[PDB]
Amino acid sequence: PDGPCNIDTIRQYVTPLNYPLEKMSDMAEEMRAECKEIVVNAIEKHEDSYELAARHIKEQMDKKYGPSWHCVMGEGFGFEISYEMKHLMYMFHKGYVAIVVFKGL
Amino acid sequence: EREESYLSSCRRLIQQCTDKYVKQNNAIDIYGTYFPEGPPVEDESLGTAS
Amino acid sequence: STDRKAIIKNADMPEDMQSDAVEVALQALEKFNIEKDIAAYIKKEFDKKYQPTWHCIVGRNFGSYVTHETHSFLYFYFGQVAILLFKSG
Amino acid sequence: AIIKNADMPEDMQSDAVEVALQALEKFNIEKDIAAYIKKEFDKKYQPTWHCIVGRNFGSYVTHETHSFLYFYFGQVAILLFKSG
Amino acid sequence: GDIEELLKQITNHPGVQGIIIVNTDGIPIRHTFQEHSRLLAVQYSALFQSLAMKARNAVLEIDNNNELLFLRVRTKKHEVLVAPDTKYLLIVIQQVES
Amino acid sequence: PSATFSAMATAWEIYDAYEEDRIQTEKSAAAVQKKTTSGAKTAEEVLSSAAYKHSLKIIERMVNQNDCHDIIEDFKYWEDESDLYKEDGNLLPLWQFFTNKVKHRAVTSIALNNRYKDLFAVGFGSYDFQRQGKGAIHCFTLKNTVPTVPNSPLPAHPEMSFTVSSGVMCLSFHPVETSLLACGLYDGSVCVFDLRMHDKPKEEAKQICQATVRSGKHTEPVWEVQWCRSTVDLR
Amino acid sequence: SEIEESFQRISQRPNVTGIIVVNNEGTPIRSTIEDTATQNQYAHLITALAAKARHCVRDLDPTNDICFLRIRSKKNEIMVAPDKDFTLIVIQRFS
């Protein structure tokens, strides 16, 4: 098999982009540094279960900054959330994966 | 694929339509261009010695 | 090829609220073109009618988990495009 | 830190910060956290003090000088005034 | 029965690999796809179904006595044909000849 | 204090974000290396865009070709069934080509290009001894067939067109380099074209060269030319 | 010029009288259709459909680009040529 209809061709196109990336953020310096570290570490830890990766993410996140956190995975989706500033996080990784992390109001 | 019977009629109509259009599409190319690129460029071995 | 059927299985709210969400999503998908303004429309309409804060996630695939207050959760999808909605405040 | 109201010495500002943070880290019930703050603060520097816990409110109280403080963490607000 | 025979008759043509039949529920079962390709099946089914929905809405809005019959769209590398029905949808994928 | 935000997550957004990162990283690296070492376009411009004429050509070709939907089908896919039983042969007419610019003249030459299956050069001239005049060369393609409705012929357009002082009955494509085309003139000279240059319309688009009497012009009309299979020298 | 020649060619033939050019902003440009409301609605709907088609193609594959579309109906036919700076739309009617 070759060409279209094969996931491997698209993966070959999107292969060499394996490291995190984002440029939209206001949230404080040490705290998004810690956030990006914890999300990438959880992504590395959990490959099969995006649920379990979200588990590990939110457990560290709220144990280290108090309650009222939320976070969602994806590789295609849209969103619109009301929030207080200095608390929004929206990262890309693997070349096709997106993440958001935020505080509830 | 069982529930009813106009499944066959629907796929027949849609499939004959798609068949004739893909048939004529495969027949001949429709979007190429003759010599899209490549007027030669020469700078060192110039065409004149002036 | 005529419309999209409703698929609901996770719910913490009454049937009137569920149905209200159903026709809201139907109207959004029918009139609007992009999940952008579909989500924007449903969020602004729900915030206007039943006070802030509503939050919605619209998509194709994603795994989500939120913290929501009393009677604030529903799992209703139309076709293979999906919408989640919740209170958070 | 978000500290805009104070009639404290610097050490009192400090140990107020640690006692409030540790109370918040333990408990989420306002009764429980205010209980920790008032009883522990009384343990440390004698009757009679009073802390106030709330996310939004209004209060207007009386105190001796060097005996009033007001401060935040996230979405909780703390008064601390002496009377008695 | 003979429907798969008609499908293989279609696939006999040069430069074609891929056929999808989509019903109202969005369950995309008719496919020249191997095991790995359920993801791409879902991809094409959902996206082309939404495209056909909006196309037919536009057609009945622009005229009430006209009914959409066929659609194609190009890329620089591919070709895809889609045909709607009152209940079903067909997608076939064709590859550019040199 | 509170705020709202919305964003969309999709493949081309991730792709072009990462891409723009690639360009800006390369720009930063180039700037570091250099330091170490040492509105919308107007409607007139839109109309004058080369993409506009490309789109026009494609769309007119397609509208003609789906006007001609069935005749291409019987061109390429038709099989005669009576010939299985009947013994001798038969023919089927497919298409006709003519232009309004070549009236009152004869058509005498045909050449074929090796690289393209569907292009052919068409040379015009007159074999009457008294009707000698100017000559024309055109390039027709099978991409632009037109229906030949009876009692109503419709002309087509050559993709390439050139004119010359005398009638031409000579056409020789060079076999491997598919752009060089030699032709001759009734007056006794020859000239060569390279139809790669047809992209640019900025001038009258002459030929490369034409023979003169000082260059060795022939004294009689010439109708036969043939290239040589060589690439070191063109002959 | 040659642009005018080809344009008059496309316009003059019967069963094909409509050509509109739509800019990036969606504002109509030099056109041949007469009715303003028909022109406006055609431009709006077709540009929306073309944007959705670009959505489709880019979502299916990021490094694959699009320049074509047409609509085929029981009585009418639509020619759509998208581009980075404009969109060319042609109208066809069947007998």
From TrEMBL, chain A:
Subcellular location: Cytoplasm, Cytoskeleton, Cilium axoneme
The keyword Cell wall biogenesis/degradation appears for this protein: no
Short name of one Pfam family: Dynein_light
Single GO cellular component term: microtubule associated complex
Known function: Force generating protein of respiratory cilia. Produces force towards the minus ends of microtubules. Dynein has ATPase activity.
Family in the record: Belongs to the dynein light chain family.
Protein name: Dynein light chain
Taxonomic source organism: Trypanosoma brucei brucei (strain 927/4 GUTat10.1)
Source species taxonomy: Eukaryota, Discoba, Euglenozoa, Kinetoplastea, Metakinetoplastina
Automatic annotation (TrEMBL), chain D:
Cited SMART domains: Dynein_light (SM01375)
Record carries keyword Cytoplasm: yes
SUPFAM superfamilies: DLC
Primary location recorded for the protein, binned into one broad class: cytoplasm
GO biological process, one term: microtubule-based process
Subcellular location: Cytoplasm, Cytoskeleton
Source organism, top-level taxon: Eukaryota
Keyword Cytoplasm recorded: yes
Keywords: Cytoplasm, Cytoskeleton, Dynein, Microtubule, Motor protein
Record-level GO cellular component terms: axoneme; cell tip; ciliary basal body; cytoplasm; cytoplasmic dynein complex; flagella connector; microtubule; microtubule associated complex
GO molecular function annotations of the record: dynein intermediate chain binding; microtubule motor activity
Family classification: Belongs to the dynein light chain family.
Entry protein name: Dynein light chain
Organism for this UniProt entry: Trypanosoma brucei brucei (strain 927/4 GUTat10.1)
Species lineage: Eukaryota, Discoba, Euglenozoa, Kinetoplastea, Metakinetoplastina
UniProtKB/TrEMBL annotation, chain E:
GO MF assignments: dynein intermediate chain binding; microtubule motor activity
GO cellular component annotations of the record: axoneme; cytoplasm; cytoplasmic dynein complex; microtubule
Main location (coarse class): cytoplasm
Keywords, sorted A to Z: Cytoplasm, Cytoskeleton, Dynein, Microtubule, Motor protein, Transport
Cell compartment(s), UniProt: Cytoplasm, Cytoskeleton
Entry keyword annotation includes Cytoplasm: yes
Keyword Magnesium: no
Domain Roadblock/LAMTOR2: 3-94
GO term, biological process aspect, one: microtubule-based movement
Family indicated by similarity: Belongs to the GAMAD family.
Function summary: Acts as one of several non-catalytic accessory components of the cytoplasmic dynein 1 complex that are thought to be involved in linking dynein to cargos and to adapter proteins that regulate dynein function. Cytoplasmic dynein 1 acts as a motor for the intracellular retrograde motility of vesicles and organelles along microtubules.
Protein name: Dynein light chain roadblock
TrEMBL record, chain G:
GO cellular component: axoneme; ciliary basal body; cytoplasm; cytoplasmic dynein complex; microtubule
Protein name (record): Dynein light chain roadblock
Record carries keyword Cytoplasm: yes
Job description of the protein: Acts as one of several non-catalytic accessory components of the cytoplasmic dynein 1 complex that are thought to be involved in linking dynein to cargos and to adapter proteins that regulate dynein function. Cytoplasmic dynein 1 acts as a motor for the intracellular retrograde motility of vesicles and organelles along microtubules.
Entry's family note: Belongs to the GAMAD family.
Places the protein is found: Cytoplasm, Cytoskeleton
Roadblock/LAMTOR2 domain: residues covered: 3-92
GO biological process, one term: microtubule-based movement
UniProt-listed Gene3D superfamilies: Dynein light chain 2a, cytoplasmic
Keywords, ordered alphabetically: Cytoplasm, Cytoskeleton, Dynein, Microtubule, Motor protein, Transport
One Gene Ontology molecular-function label: dynein intermediate chain binding
